[PDB]
């Protein structure tokens, strides 16, 4: 795979939905091998990476732990913008300078 996990951290997901979103993303990263590349991005009125990785990194134990620990730190605030978040997602899957 080459996933890109687009979390929606906007206002309306606060509360339970955010607990479920961060558990779901943890268990989505758990289904990734070392041949699969992943990167978690989150959007609320503008999209940004949840972690330090700015591209698709490999889904090995260390990178997956960094992504999980970033995801669990995520917080809900602001209006949702699907266009600005999907621009980010589609642009990060066209980045061929990195190993993929």
Partner 1 sequence: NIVRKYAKKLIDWPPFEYMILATIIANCIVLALEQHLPEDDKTPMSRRLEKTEPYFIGIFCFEAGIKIVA
What phi and psi, each to the nearest 5 degrees, are found at residue 58? -75, 150
DSSP string for residues in 53-96: --S-EE--HHHHHHHHHHHTT----S---HHHHHHHHHHHSS-T
Q: Cα(69)–Cα(86) distance, rounded to whole angstroms?
A: 23
C-beta of 12 vs 24, nearer to partner 1: 12
**Residue 8, annotated as binding a ligand:** yes
Q: Which does 73 bind (CB under 5 to 8 A by kind): Ca ion, ligand NAG, partner 1, none?
A: ligand NAG
Least CB distance to ligand NAG at residue 85 (A): 17
If residue 22 lies in a helix (H) or strand (E), which one and from where to where?
helix 16-29
51 belongs to an annotated ligand binding site: no
Binding interface with partner 1 (CB under 8 A): 10-12, 14-15, 76-80
Say whether residue 99 binds ligand NAG (CB under 6 A): no
The reply to whether 87 sits near Ca ion by the rule CB under 5 A is no
Q: Identify the residue whose tokens are 């972690």.
A: 51
Can residue 46 be called a binding residue for ligand NAG (CB under 6 A)? Answer: no
Q: Is 10 annotated as a binding residue?
A: yes
Question: Binding site residues for a divalent metal cation, as ranges?
Answer: 8, 10, 12
């Amino acid at each position: 795979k080459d996933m890109l996990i687009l979390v929606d951290v906007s206002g309306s997901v606060s509360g339970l939905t955010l607990k479920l979103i961060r558990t779901s993303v943890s268990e989505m990263l758990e289904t990734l091998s070392d041949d699969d590349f992943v990167n978690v991005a989150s959007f609320n009125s503008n999209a940004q990476d949840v972690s330090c990785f700015q591209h698709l990194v490999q889904a090995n134990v260390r990178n997956k732990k960094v992504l999980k620990d970033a995801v669990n730190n995520i917080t809900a605030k602001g209006i949702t913008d699907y266009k600005k978040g999907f621009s980010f997602a589609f642009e990060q899957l066209l980045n061929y300078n990195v190993s993929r």
